[PDB]
C-alpha cells in the first residue's frame, strides 16, 4: 500500500483553506464536504492519501484542436493522480477517458443574477443583449452549451463564444465577482449546488432564478483500469445507504439565516 494522490479543487464548500492553513501542513490545510468525503472513502478502501490541488485550477475539458485534456480529468488521464474527489460532473465525454462512481450529489445548471436584474429564465437571457452572461471556462457547464442543439441553449452558445470582452471566467469566484460588480449587466451560469451556497451568504446580493437547465451528478473519478474502482463504488454506495452523504451535505450547506 502506497500513498494515493487525490486531485481536487478549491471550490467552496467542497474544499476550502482552513483559517490557519498557514500554520498547518498536509491534508490538514483543508476542510469542506469533499475533504470529509475523502477521509471516509479512504477509510473504507483502506488507503492513505495525499490531497493535491489541481495544478491548472480547472475541472477538465478536451482541447478542440489538440484533443488533450486539462484540469483534474487530465491529472487522471495522464497518470499524475490516482483519484479525483471533488464536485466533478459525470458526463459522456469524460466517461470515455476515465471512470465514475455512482453519483454522490445531484445538481443541474442554473442562473445567478444580481438582485434587481430583469431575468427570470434562460429564455429571457437568450432574447436580449444588454445583460451579458457566461460560464466557468473549462468545465461541464461550458460543454453543455457548446454541444447543445436545443434552440435557446444553441442561441446562448452562439452569443457566448463570440462576445467581447470574453464572458468566460477562470474560476467560480471570478464569475461570482463579475456578477456583483457588473451592476446587473452580467449573469452567471453555474451549477445549483454552488449557486445555493453563495445565495445564502453575505452580502446576499445575488440569487438563483428559474429552474435547473438539466440534471446530473458529481462522481468520484478514477483512471481507466484503476485498482480502486470497485472499492470506491462500494464505499460511495455504503455511504449513500447509511444517509451519510445527505447529512454531510446538510452540514456544509447549513444556512445561518445570514440572508
Ligand atoms: N462541475 C463542473 C465545473 C463547474 C461548472 O462547469 O459550472 C465540472 O465538473 O466541469
Ligand atoms: Zn490564506
Ligand atoms: Zn464511514
Curated annotation (Swiss-Prot):
Positions of L-glutamate binding: 87, 89, 94, 140-141, 191
Lineage: Eukaryota, Metazoa, Chordata, Craniata, Vertebrata
Further comment: The postsynaptic actions of L-glutamate are mediated by a variety of receptors that are named according to their selective agonists. This receptor binds AMPA (quisqualate) > L-glutamate > kainate.
Family: Belongs to the glutamate-gated ion channel (TC 1.A.10.1) family. GRIA2 subfamily.
Full protein name: Glutamate receptor 2
Positions marked as site (Crucial to convey clamshell closure to channel opening): 119
Disulfide partners: 204-259
Residue spans, topological domain Extracellular: 118-259
Residues the record marks as site: Interaction with the cone snail toxin Con-ikot-ikot: 62, 146, 238
Residues with Phosphoserine modification: 148, 182
Summary of subunit composition and partner proteins: Homotetramer or heterotetramer of pore-forming glutamate receptor subunits. Tetramers may be formed by the dimerization of dimers. May interact with MPP4. Forms a ternary complex with GRIP1 and CSPG4. Interacts with ATAD1 in an ATP-dependent manner. ATAD1-catalyzed ATP hydrolysis disrupts binding to ATAD1 and to GRIP1 and leads to AMPAR complex disassembly. Interacts with GRIP2. Interacts with GRIP1. Interacts with NSF via its C-terminus. Interacts with CACNG2, PICK1 and GRIP2. Interacts with GRIA1 and SYNDIG1. Part of a complex containing GRIA2, NSF and NAPA and/or NAPB.
Tissue-level expression: Detected in forebrain. Detected in dendrites of neuronal cells. Expressed in the pyramidal cell layers of CA1 and CA3 and in the granule cell layer of the dentate gyrus.
Domain remark text: The M4 transmembrane segment mediates tetramerization and is required for cell surface expression.
Glycan attachment points: 1
UniProt subcellular location: Cell membrane; Postsynaptic cell membrane; Postsynaptic density membrane
Function field: Ionotropic glutamate receptor that functions as a ligand-gated cation channel, gated by L-glutamate and glutamatergic agonists such as alpha-amino-3-hydroxy-5-methyl-4-isoxazolepropionic acid (AMPA), quisqualic acid, and kainic acid. L-glutamate acts as an excitatory neurotransmitter at many synapses in the central nervous system and plays an important role in fast excitatory synaptic transmission.
Record PTM text: Palmitoylated. Depalmitoylated upon L-glutamate stimulation.
Highest taxon of source: Eukaryota
Induction info: Down-regulated in the pyramidal cell layer of CA1 in the hippocampus by global ischemia.
Location of this fragment in the whole protein: 413 to 794 of 883
Amino acid at each position: 500500500n502506497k500513498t494515493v494522490v487525490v486531485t481536487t479543487i478549491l471550490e467552496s464548500p467542497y474544499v476550502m483553506m482552513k483559517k490557519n492553513h498557514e500554520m498547518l501542513e498536509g491534508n490538514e490545510r483543508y476542510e469542506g464536504y469533499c475533504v470529509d468525503l475523502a477521509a471516509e472513502i479512504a477509510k473504507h478502501c483502506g488507503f492513505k492519501y495525499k490531497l493535491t490541488i489541481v495544478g491548472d485550477g480547472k475541472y477538465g475539458a478536451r482541447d478542440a484542436d489538440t484533443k488533450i485534456w486539462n484540469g483534474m480529468v487530465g491529472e487522471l488521464v495522464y497518470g499524475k493522480a490516482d483519484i479525483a474527489i471533488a464536485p466533478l460532473t459525470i458526463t459522456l465525454v469524460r466517461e470515455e477517458v476515465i471512470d465514475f462512481s455512482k453519483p454522490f450529489m445531484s445538481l443541474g445548471i442554473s442562473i445567478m443574477i444580481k438582485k434587481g436584474t430583469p431575468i427570470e429564465s434562460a429564455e429571457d437571457l437568450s432574447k436580449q443583449t444588454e445583460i451579458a452572461y457566461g460560464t466557468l471556462d473549462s468545465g461541464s457547464t461550458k460543454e453543455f452549451f457548446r454541444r447543445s442543439k436545443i434552440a435557446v441553449f444553441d442561441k446562448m452558445w452562439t452569443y457566448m463564444r463570440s462576445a467581447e470582452p470574453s464572458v468566460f471566467v477562470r474560476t467560480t469566484a471570478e464569475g461570482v465577482a463579475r456578477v456583483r460588480k457588473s451592476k446587473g449587466k452580467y449573469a452567471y451560469l453555474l451549477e445549483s449546488t454552488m449557486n445555493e451556497y453563495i445565495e445564502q451568504r453575505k452580502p446576499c446580493d445575488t440569487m438563483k432564478v428559474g429552474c435547473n437547465l438539466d440534471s446530473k451528478g458529481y462522481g468520484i473519478a478514477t483512471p481507466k483500469g484503476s485498482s480502486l474502482g470497485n472499492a470506491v463504488n462500494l464505499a460511495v454506495l455504503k455511504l449513500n445507504e447509511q444517509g451519510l452523504l445527505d447529512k454531510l451535505k446538510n452540514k456544509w450547506w447549513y444556512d445561518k439565516g445570514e440572508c
